[PDB]
Design a protein around this ligand. Structure first.
Ligand code: CTP
Ligand code: CTP
Ligand code: CTP
Ligand code: CTP
Ligand code: CTP
Ligand code: CTP
Ligand code: MG
Ligand code: MG
Ligand code: MG
Ligand code: MG
Ligand code: MG
Ligand code: MG
Lengths: 559, 559, 559
């Protein structure tokens, strides 16, 4: 086993999550079975309690574990599947050892937070890094630990102590620390004193740093690096600069130009880890897929405009997984992406009574879009705008994907505007009216990776061509409310055909509309399973249809 | 009793199985009641657990014993019937003696693998070689043992020790060893050092060789033989060469030109075995049937093209028994065979959306074929191509045989395309839909040689003419799923007549379609029962219909 | 993790088990949490099927796992508790992977013994060496693997391959090989060619040796070591000599004079393993307990004679754990031990009709003994001699311990000779007579470590003083037959008081007779739990009573 801990910061907004998700990617190019752990200093047990307004979207794992965003960034960069244990939190570990006290397992000793709770952290990291994460049950070679918060805090405090002991309870040369740090620029001069005042605290809290990964606004001066290597004890080759480049998928290749694999190969003796040619050649091939997709980003010019239609579009992190899946689908089509933020409530005609500028800008963005996405919203208060965009996408022939709530407004749209029931309703919203035309029903939660089976006649469905025509699809779910299955025999007659269903047959999970270029609902969330080299099939479908050449993508899949 | 053990190899891919199946054939020309034993060093109990992708097809014996391919090669060369005991394996003998330990039969001694387990091998070979195998219950005169793996391994190790003791526990002059060996050619020179480095190991592991059966790319030089006879202790007449010739049915006659009967008659004193004229004259007559059928192969020119339509056609060993039965049927018709590999999924119209070249090449091969075979596939994922080939074979009048799954897609085709139920389905595939037009039902396994009785009106059926009009047929089965017997009264009315059924009447086992030149389903497997001088009657039917002169074959049978 | 494999031999009787049990002891003096694994090439699943005549006694583990003797030698040298998984066997691993085939877990591949079964060995050793074995659930630092059989065999063959891969699947510098070897002496010359013909085979089978641990009859000549270091590649300091010394408890200190800790500290980098002072100071203290107890053996002169009374005394290995527990008890009392082998059937008066010399020698040895032991025999055919020795031990006041069957003949003796029922009987023997005075009953097996609770009044019992007066005792059991609990209220009245019972109260497990210097039955086996620095309390009681100063031992315990 080996560990690399990514850590530090003068400030908590500094962006450690790319250097974690990008260090682990570079180590996966050596062919190593890499894994990752997030530490979050917040008290939440797991993210399911905190709304998407409050620091971004509610992620989903194979377990159903509603979790921190930063798990998702490692899953999509590293190709790995994570579990709800990979998110260490102050909530979890304190709830764990305090529940263990009432169980009695410390034999009625004191449960001081030094010794015993820092021992539970060091045990948890050693459990979790041995859980398998790739397509086979082989245990990881290297674990990337992202230490949330900063080193020099009061929510960080048990973790930085636990990791001082863990620098020895796992031997040095099986552990390395990467310290992210701030180097401000003021009046044209690079200021390395915030960094030198977090190297003092790092040595004090007891870890010793290996890298000094500065988030400067610039290239670091040769004299700036020379002084950081005088005040921190690292050699000047190790003072990596992580400055902005044309997209975040380039960041691994900047770190590779900055020798970071050659340093980590030495500093963790990675030549002593046992690897097969099936490991190593997969490693060097994955490097060439990353060099190819970044070269394709560097000279892709032909734009594709996708309208993302929903509430809270000013909080873009409320959709981080939706955005990132369109970026993967974009780079695979070799069309450059623009996403058009349509704040759905502005499409509703009553907006014309409040501000006409909002009513025109939103319908302008929607009309300009080469493809349309209803992105699995939350709450109900924007729903009429999401219905109008689904009417537009059906009648104007524009490519369409409905995710989760998106499948459900598509059924509501089709009921109101093709089946001809204008009172038909989201039972998710208009409940205590008790009306008969209910497009949905509550069936109290359903979460995690679940099996979707294709219905028998489905051969013609573009969505089934995009899934490689395989009879079952494994994808991640969230929904309380599902389509009322007593309308399905009507929709099945009117050309709205339910391509895919749950294994009991009673629950509807995919539809495709007959006789449209690409119009799909998926009631699972296709966002979360997308990887940077394997875009999620419904999202690859959307960005292909909007680019043209949907047929040529269907060959690239099925060959 | 006498034994000939066929053994050895520098490399395991060297092809011992022909020299075994061809040594035993030469001894059967002396009229001896020959038998054979396969040793397989793998840990499988029996082949039923390992899929046809993984080292070829899943064979079937009279017992229902799902077994190694190499049993089949002896059955068809030697005319013998084998039993699941004739396949010795590392799985079987270790499962046997370790189960015998918990039963207690070693009286609470240690069960060392020397002495006791090598004694169980020497007991098993002495049990098995006394089991009868011909058309009468007479015990074998000579047993051919094929030692799988190589002599000089760790999976071979108990067998080569057991056979060192067995060289004495059965006397010398009742035992002989044939060592197959590699003589590479490099820069134009024959290299006999791989062979001399397996004669060293053979003497070391303790058996002494009799023959040195080289698999060179060439005729062995007279100086190459002279040096192999200097480093091995065999005389130069005994260094047989087993080089390639125009078909594997010639290999016995090469070994007969190379004195191998005259040597084995001496080296095992085969003149001292008691034989009747009914043995000896059957022996010398069978030799003339082999000289005749090889002479017929040497100047047969008129081709017959048979389309073999199924999944995994790149894995030709997944169909080894199907191929070999067509070769017997070919040589009996005196038409030279070409088999057209139709990878069935390419016939499905959706292939035109993926690669048109595959769609044309597959329909081109199918259209070019003089006869068509649906070869008892496995899984379900190619089934629509196998249905289209059955539609083609019915409407275009081309000769057709459906084996196992082949009978079942023929019923599905006939239901969809003549009875007019386009939703009718393989219950083997489309199960949890619970539809009413089920062409099949599960009835949990059914294996081995079973009795098929012809239904009363059957006199006109070409398949019943090919079985000599005899009222019952004994053939080998495998099927979980069988035709739904509640459709049969419809098919019986529409000219799809079930010529043969199980003894209870409730299960359907053969059909022939009225008013077509030759269109047959058999739900048993006709492949496995074919012998090199007695081709399986449905396969003799197919290759005759495709050659023309199906009527002239029906005289050759019934006279 | 670290491994040391102890291996090799020109001959299998060479005595590797001391060098294993003594290498692991030396590593435990560094304070490392050492564990050990036995490999036995025999086909037995576990030793319960093989009688104590056939290669020695039937051991017992905490699990109830009836196991190879050699587990016991590590338990008593290393202080560790083992589990039935620590005994790898050819029986177990082949029964495991062949049972795994019928379960299907190789996905229907071939299960060749190369790749897949050698992978199961390498998995089993990596599972087993992480099971905890000390008084706390901390996983081992170093594992000693004793490779049974020899390197250069056919029962060894999968293990030596598995260990060639395991030299890399665990990195070099986490693995070391110790090769035990034979150096015969003939006509006064040391012959190192058997050794040089097992170094050739070792390199061939692919492991590389580190030590060359010769079992010569002598000190190795400086020229003999120099030539072994010329033909093996080890340096001459590493050619350890393991010659005979005054008792086997000295062997670790010979290996310590021969630098073997200083070599293993270097060759496995044991300075890089994390240790506490509670580890290290326990390590260096345990070394001084071993230096003290070996110094006490070097000048202890005052003999104590213990009669071991039972069947099969010519097969001393049928009692190896009984003998070894008396040696621990001896060295703790500082009296030198003689054990008097009383073949129990010779004490029976009918022997006087067959050979008077046997009748006198056996009663002479019994009369000469300072203490008496009935050692948990097997079968029944010597029982009357074991009853007469129990009569003698009760009436002549001599110190007595009955183990298992020993407690039971003590109840039978007391019934016949104090309660006055001369027909009272072992129901273990005289069953189908159906008599009313049954001293025993069948209650179908009971095995492993079980809880014994002391009965309330027990304060005066010397056995309860020897157990430190603690209310519950944890010790290892074997018995089908137990004392008939309907006699206990009589024995409890006559001064035969059942000091200890099972937690249900219904089963009787210890007795002590009132008003005798030391007379104890234990129905568990106290032998197996004795350690070289912690002799089993009933056996420490016996050898103390026989030495005199039983009171002074009771202070050494309770202080
Ligand atoms: N490979 C990555 C990593 C991060 N981000 C972006 O980074 C964001 C949040 O910043 P991040 O780098 O994850 O760190 P912070 O949120 O600043 O938090 P912290 O520094 O506490 O780790 C999101 O907007 C996400 O789009 C990204 O696009 N690609
Ligand atoms: N740890 C330090 C670093 C610097 N100085 C002194 O503080 C003066 C002003 O600090 P500065 O020159 O700004 O040093 P930097 O570390 O570069 O500060 P910044 O990065 O913000 O420019 C220096 O000339 C030096 O004499 C100090 O006392 N202690
Ligand atoms: N009389 C024979 C014997 C073998 N084969 C061909 O030989 C094959 C496999 O090789 P074989 O000679 O059976 O031996 P190997 O598979 O090489 O295995 P081994 O050498 O371990 O016995 C099959 O493709 C089969 O068509 C054949 O056509 N006719
Ligand atoms: N068992 C043997 C055989 C040959 N030689 C020597 O090795 C030399 C080279 O071997 P080579 O001449 O190639 O002998 P072959 O056995 O024919 O090797 P190959 O079949 O590969 O040509 C010979 O001249 C001979 O002196 C040897 O030492 N031991
Ligand atoms: N620390 C030890 C180790 C072994 N023995 C003695 O050694 C015996 C058996 O020999 P052992 O050294 O265990 O090995 P072998 O039986 O010769 O078997 P192998 O060489 O196959 O391991 C028993 O009589 C036992 O008394 C001992 O007294 N003390
Ligand atoms: N591997 C070896 C070792 C020795 N010799 C030769 O064989 C002769 C006789 O062997 P010996 O002198 O007995 O060597 P040892 O290895 O000591 O044999 P032993 O230990 O039995 O005395 C030696 O003089 C030497 O020339 C050899 O050919 N090959
Ligand atoms: Mg803040
Ligand atoms: Mg972050
Ligand atoms: Mg191979
Ligand atoms: Mg073969
Ligand atoms: Mg022996
Ligand atoms: Mg031993």
């Amino acid at each position: 086993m080996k560990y690399v801990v990514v850590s530090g910061g003068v400030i908590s907004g500094i962006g450690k999550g790319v250097l974690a998700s990008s260090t682990g990617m570079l180590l996966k190019t050596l062919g190593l079975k890499v894994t990752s752990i997030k530490i979050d200093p917040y008290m939440n047990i797991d993210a399911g309690t905190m709304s998407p307004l409050e620091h971004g979207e509610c992620f989903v794992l194979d377990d159903g574990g509603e979790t921190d965003l930063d798990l998702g960034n490692y899953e999509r960069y590293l190709g790995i599947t994570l579990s709800r244990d990979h998110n260490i939190t102050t909530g979890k570990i304190y709830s764990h050892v305090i529940s263990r006290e009432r169980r009695g397992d410390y034999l009625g000793k004191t449960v001081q937070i030094v010794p015993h709770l820092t021992n539970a952290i060091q045990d948890w990291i050693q459990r979790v890094s041995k859980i398998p994460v790739d397509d086979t049950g082989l245990e990881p070679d290297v674990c990337i630990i992202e230490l949330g918060g900063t080193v020099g805090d009061i929510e960080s405090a048990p973790f930085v102590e636990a990791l001082r002991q863990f620098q020895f309870e796992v031997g040095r040369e099986n552990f390395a620390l990467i310290h992210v740090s701030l180097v401000p620029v003021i009046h044209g001069e690079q200021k390395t004193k915030p960094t030198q005042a977090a190297i003092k605290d790092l040595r004090s809290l007891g870890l010793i740093p290996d890298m000094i990964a500065c988030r400067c606004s610039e290239e670091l001066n040769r004299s700036t690096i020379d002084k950081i290597a005088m005040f921190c004890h690292v050699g000047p080759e190790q003072v990596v600069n992580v400055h902005d480049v044309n997209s975040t998928y380039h960041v691994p290749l900047l770190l590779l130009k900055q020798h970071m694999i050659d340093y980590l190969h030495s500093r963790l003796k990675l030549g002593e880890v046992p690897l097969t040619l099936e490991d190593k050649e997969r490693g060097s091939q994955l490097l060439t897929n990353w060099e190819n997709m970044t070269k394709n980003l560097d000279d892709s010019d032909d734009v594709v405009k996708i309208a993302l239609v929903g509430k809270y579009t000013n909080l873009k992190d409320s959709y981080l997984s939706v955005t990132k899946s369109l970026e993967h689908a974009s780079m695979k089509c070799r069309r450059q992406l623009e996403i058009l933020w349509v704040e759905a409530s502005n499409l509703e005609p009553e907006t014309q009574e409040v501000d006409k500028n909002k009513f025109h800008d939103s319908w302008n963005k929607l009309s300009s879009a080469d493809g349309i996405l209803v992105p699995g919203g939350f709450g109900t208060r924007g729903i009429e705008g999401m219905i109008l965009a689904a009417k537009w996408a059906r009648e104007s022939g524009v490519p369409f994907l409905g995710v989760c709530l998106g499948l459900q407004v598509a059924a509501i749209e089709f009921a109101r505007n093709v089946i001809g029931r204008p009172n038909s309703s989201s039972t998710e919203f208009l409940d205590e009216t008790l009306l008969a035309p209910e497009d949905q029903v509550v069936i109290t939660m359903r979460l995690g990776l679940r099996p979707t089976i294709f219905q028998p006649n489905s051969e013609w469905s573009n969505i089934r061509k995009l899934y490689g025509e395989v009879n079952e699809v494994h994808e991640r779910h969230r929904h309380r409310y599902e389509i009322n299955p007593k309308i399905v025999n009507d929709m099945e007659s009117r050309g709205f055909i339910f391509v895919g269903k749950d294994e009991t047959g009673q629950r509807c999970e995919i539809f495709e509309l007959k006789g449209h270029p690409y119009y799909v609902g998926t009631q699972y969330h296709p966002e979360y399973t997308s990887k940077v080299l394997e875009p999620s099939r419904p999202f690859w479908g959307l960005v292909a249809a909007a680019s043209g050449t949907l047929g040529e993508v269907i060959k690239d899949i099925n060959l």
